A paper describes a structure:
Calcium-activated chloride channels (CACC) facilitate transmembrane anion conduction in response to the increase of the intracellular Ca2+ concentration. The most prominent CACC is formed by TMEM16A, which is expressed in different tissues of the human body. Structures of both functional branches have revealed the general architecture of the family.
We next investigated the structure of the constitutively active mutant I551A in the presence of Ca2+. Although at a lower resolution of 4.1 Å, the general correspondence of the mutant structure to WT emphasizes their equivalent properties in the Ca2+-bound state. Whereas the mutant resembles WT in the Ca2+-bound state, the Ca2+-free structure of I551A exhibits pronounced differences compared to the corresponding structure of WT.
Numbering used by the authors:
A (entry chain B), B (entry chain A): 117 to 130, 165 to 259, 267 to 466, 488 to 668, 683 to 910
Write the structure that this text describes.
């Protein structure tokens, strides 16, 4: 008895009298083409539509889409707009749904203001067919859930054509983009594990690792705490140092070059795939501007200046946005400063002494992650509020400005931890003699023994494991399900089952999360190789997970059309242009690559290197400490202390210069900047060259569109 | 008696019998629409055409151009393709000429192969009307020569519409581009002379100039020659040093930032002007691909592999092109090395002693300029030959590849003088103790006293004066005129007068020369401000000069159509992207800006600077010379010599280190690279931001194209 319907509405069964008055007035506008029909239920009833056929011809030449034809060149039919195809039973419920949605948009108060009132609840099309049923008559939703949206069929491809024709163009483009993303993430991940195993095959045969773990030399160290620690041996940090060697060999620079070139070729390959996709569907997705009705506060402000009687308002909301994002980055760095106070002075009062010193930084990044998720929530909501106060012109413009503001907020708050740990961790602290004070209090911030890269490597590694594979996937699969179970604490028609499903929130969260992952996996690959492995695993989970989400825990979308990806290809190009200038900085300002090379070239006095640590570790006469800055226990853990060493490129204390800037500091900084210059310029040239040499329209469409134009112009005479 | 004609041909009046046989066969193809007519003359006769009217309707819907309409919105008529306008006497001779040229192209052997044979000479349309006559009946060529192409009307604008409608789209776009170029060159030139007068207003009040010209201190100098000179005083070079101060103040960095931002906004403004221009003419210049007949050796090679039975050939001609351009840059630097041997050892044997030392470098750049003009000729001819051996597909592809190869050749051979003088002049010579030998002969190359910038400044200044204002303009106005006078050593119908005029050589020389000038005036503005002044003068001459050239000493062009500028906007964007990375290098590696700033910041021990020269001038004990490297006359010109000074950032000889690399050398190199990094990254961001924030379609076309589409769709019903 379930007939052929389209795009139900909501009636609010028992101001409310004004609400039902307009909810009966506007259906007189809505029966200008199609008479409605209503429904019955137990909670609250609703309205419904039954389109008759020629109305879709009445708007089809008014909304010209290139539907199917009768002819075919080479066993692949061509497409034309609307004339004399006349099959009369060949439309699709996606097309019929977006047509009747267009008609619902056509009414004027419009339907958007009606939804903003509360006279309705939601007006969304109905899903055709119950998935995973007992005897269900092969509808495309159930077939798609069977063969696309469960993890057993993760190994085979994605049915792009059917997911488009059932969900519309936007979700089809998004999932085809995720498919191209994973398939281009495959070879970069394979070369990533190749360079990782190169690191493991030279985890021993490199020299400074052995020079660090060679015992009996009793290489002491300055305490790197204000007062609550003592001197110690570098060979106690040799484990983390040998671990750090794994990521910064002279092959990780090749890996970084490969990943930047990979971002370039992925961008070009996705342009080509999207062009072929738009060929395989509607030949253009071009629609005439101002198709949407102008937004409600636009016309309200029009009437306001009509009763009142500008250029300052966009600029003032832009500068207050700049103040917002600057307070956001400062709040990110101060919340990382707070996260450095995870367990301050556990030695003195608690004295539990778990003796790991990898669990404390893990606790720090854990509390940073939970507070930054909360700040993501606050920034998203207040950014949506601010873009509402924007009063933008159209929904395309409002949506673009909103997603730009929200991506800038999310990007800065979820990247300034890693940026701060890379380039502002110990670059600012003074020498062992004197330390810079934070609001005249004490030492600012100092980082772990055995390289300052490994802290960032572990933080980024477990941010990529946790907040992508585990945390975000599990909360996305759980939180709407848990809201459903909360309501579940509190026959079955297709409207009746479609009411309880979750409303749609757009494509912005999936785009935003995947672009955050892209920002990781092309901004911080040089210090941390095998980021494409975790991005591959998250994507393998994510495509089928969000497929299952769409087909099970989501109401039917409205199936809008847009041949462009959106703002997100521009944001991808932006992150790809930022990738080289941050990879250069991470190689030349965190890794031990460039000092290793400059010591191999200049001060070697031999073929290969030896005593590199014995070269960089400048000493410090312990008589020259400041008052109070002495360690509380010169315990003589090993040999003895008379001096302490530290690798800050300074002169020895016995020189007439005491602890000033030595020359080799200027030498290594010169070589560092020389590498940044040559790296950035050369590989930026190589990126723009591999974008020039790649055609953006391949040799299979470039002739074929003209060939079907030949077929059209030869048929069109008579 | 001069009736209404179109596009004459050439008949070769008395193999030759085969020549006249095909020259009678193909006119049977050519009378498929239009019967010909012939002519009589004294030297050698010709053929001619008289189009009848409806043939242009017969190809007009076949070649759809948006001609004029009958209606108008807002006193500006709209345009439509070809239906029911029916004025029957409204075509233009430009349109009729390109139509009959299209018909001449339509014949198959085609007309291009016929011109390649020699059976013809040339087939070009006729100019309508003799310019500057006594009683001439107001034809557009004479009017255009009166009011556009003579230097008295240089002060007013350019008539873009009429020069298009008389010459076609390509020359119209070119001259409108030159107009936009000059009009956007105006404000950059004004700010250039502002920063120049700032330099003149601080030519005295800066400190190191006074510290150089302060006498009685007897600041000696190392000889900077192998053997044939002596020591000397820096105050003898203080004149050129005070001149050098004029160009490298801390305001020339602002000027360089302004010029790079100017290149960005000129690019955007020219995109906007070209878009508005294409609105003001044909709404699209889009034509269906493969409109041209495939090239002759393409089909010949098709038949060759048809009788013979690839991917290697494009790659082998590309690598041989790379070998060609590498030999070109090496030949440029070796010809500058030869040009350094202008007058070697004039002191010893000739002893004329003109005592200028500005005339010798002028002679060097003069001989470099004449030999590089000869090399331009050789490279252009052999590059045309190589692109013929390319066997390209179409004339668009062949022309693009040819102009790319020729521009790369011309650009490298006419820029490696300035690049070599900037960044490879004295950066490679050793210390005064030991010098690097060129093929174990003697000292490589050393540059002038009083800064090494001023040599480049004078060389670039007089290359911009001579080889743009004087030499190229005078040879372009002279050489075809002189060939005409050579033939002049050896009634008057329009064909009869049109035969003796010069054939057309395309737009590539004017584009190429103007892009070379752009490359100067945005690649080397930082060292040499007021390059926009000379570019403004050359352009003010050049627009009216080439206008006069077109309308007087040039046959009528064929008036092809293309809505794009061509490859030249891409080449402009390329030079604009190279501009920042070469301006950064010229500021931080030739100027005295960044060492001035690093001495102002670090080693000052005072507020402002003093003894900057006394800081950089490291000394040299004269006992430590090599054998033979001593000067031939320790003449004691002034005080006395016991040591010689030189500004190469080395330690004094009395240190236990003798003449090694000092620390402050590493310091200033670090600061240099830091400035290159911050400059390049910041202003590249500012360029891409000022390209983002500028819309590429203004608010006067964006609505108006849709408004005339509204008019078209409202008229088109009935
Ligand atoms: Ca997730
Ligand atoms: Ca997700
Ligand atoms: Ca010239
Ligand atoms: Ca010229």
């Amino acid at each position: 008895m379930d007939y052929h319907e389209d795009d139900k509405r909501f009636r609010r069964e028992e101001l409310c009298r004004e609400a039902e008055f307009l909810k009966l007035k506007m259906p007189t506008k809505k029966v200008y083409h199609i008479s409605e029909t209503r429904g019955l239920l137990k909670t609250i009833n609703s309205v419904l539509q039954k389109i008759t056929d020629p109305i879709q011809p009445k708007v089809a030449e008014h909304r010209p889409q290139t539907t199917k034809r009768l002819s075919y060149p080479f066993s692949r039919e061509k497409q034309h707009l609307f004339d004399l195809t006349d099959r009369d039973s060949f439309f699709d419920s996606k097309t019929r749904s977006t047509i009747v949605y267009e008609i619902l948009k056509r009414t004027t108060c419009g339907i958007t203001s009606l939804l903003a009132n509360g006279v309705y609840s939601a007006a969304y099309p109905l899903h055709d067919g119950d998935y995973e049923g007992d005897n269900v008559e092969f509808n495309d939703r159930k077939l798609l859930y069977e063969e696309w949206a469960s993890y057993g069929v993760f190994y085979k491809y994605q049915p792009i054509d059917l997911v488009r024709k059932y969900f519309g163009e936007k979700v089809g483009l998004y999932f085809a983009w995720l498919g191209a993303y994973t398939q281009m993430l495959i070879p970069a991940s394979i070369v990533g594990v190749i360079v990782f195993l190169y690191g493991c095959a030279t985890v021993d045969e490199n020299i400074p690792s052995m020079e660090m773990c060679d015992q009996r030399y009793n290489i002491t160290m300055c305490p790197l705490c204000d007062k609550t620690c003592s001197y110690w041996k570098m060979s106690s940090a040799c484990a983390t140092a040998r671990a750090s060697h794994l990521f910064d060999n002279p092959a990780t620079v090749f890996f970084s070059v490969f990943m930047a070139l990979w971002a370039a070729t992925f961008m070009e390959h996705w342009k080509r795939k999207q062009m072929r996709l738009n060929y395989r569907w509607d030949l253009t997705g071009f629609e005439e501007e101002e198709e949407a009705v102008k937004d409600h506060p636009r016309a309200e402000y029009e009437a306001r200046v009509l009763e009142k009687s500008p250029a300052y308002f966009t600029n003032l909301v832009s500068i207050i946005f700049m103040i917002a994002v600057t307070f956001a980055i400062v709040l990110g760095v101060i919340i990382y400063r707070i996260s450095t106070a995870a367990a301050l002075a556990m030695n003195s009062s608690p004295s539990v002494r778990s003796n790991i010193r990898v669990t404390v930084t893990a606790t720090a990044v854990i509390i940073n992650l939970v507070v930054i998720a909360l700040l993501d929530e606050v920034y998203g909501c207040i950014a949506r509020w601010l873009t509402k106060i924007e009063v933008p012109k159209t929904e395309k413009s409002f949506e673009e400005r909103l997603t730009f503001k929200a991506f800038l907020l999310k990007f800065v708050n979820s990247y300034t931890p890693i940026f701060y740990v890379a380039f502002f961790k110990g670059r600012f602290v003074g020498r062992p003699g004197d330390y810079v004070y934070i609001f005249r209090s004490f030492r600012m911030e100092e980082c772990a023994p055995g390289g300052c890269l490994m802290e960032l490597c572990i933080q980024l590694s477990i941010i990529m494991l946790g907040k992508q594979l585990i945390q975000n996937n599990l909360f996305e699969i759980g939180i709407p399900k848990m809201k459903k179970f909360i309501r579940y604490l509190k026959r079955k028609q297709r409207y009746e089952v479609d009411f309880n499903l979750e409303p749609f929130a757009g494509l912005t969260p999936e785009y935003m999360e995947m672009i955050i992952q892209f920002g990781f996996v092309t901004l911080f690959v040089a210090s941390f190789p095998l980021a494409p492995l975790f991005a591959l695993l998250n994507n393998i989970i994510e495509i089928r997970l969000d497929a299952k989400k769409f087909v099970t825990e989501l109401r039917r979308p409205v199936a809008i059309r847009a041949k462009d990806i959106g703002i997100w290809y521009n944001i991808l190009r932006g992150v790809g242009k930022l990738a080289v200038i941050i990879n250069a900085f991470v190689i030349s300002f965190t890794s031990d690559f460039i000092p290793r090379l400059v010591y191999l070239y200049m001060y070697s006095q031999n073929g290969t290197m030896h005593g590199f640590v014995n070269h960089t570790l400048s000493s410090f006469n312990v008589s020259d400490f400041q008052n109070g800055t002495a360690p509380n226990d010169p315990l003589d853990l090993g040999y003895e202390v008379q001096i302490c060493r530290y690798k800050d490129y300074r002169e020895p204390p016995w020189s007439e210069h005491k602890y000033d800037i030595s020359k080799d500091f200027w030498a290594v900084l010169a070589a560092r900047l020389a590498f940044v210059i040559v790296f950035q310029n050369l590989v930026m040239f190589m990126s723009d060259f591999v974008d020039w040499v790649i055609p953006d329209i391949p040799k299979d469409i470039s002739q074929q569109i003209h060939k079907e134009k030949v077929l059209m112009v030869e048929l069109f005479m008579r």
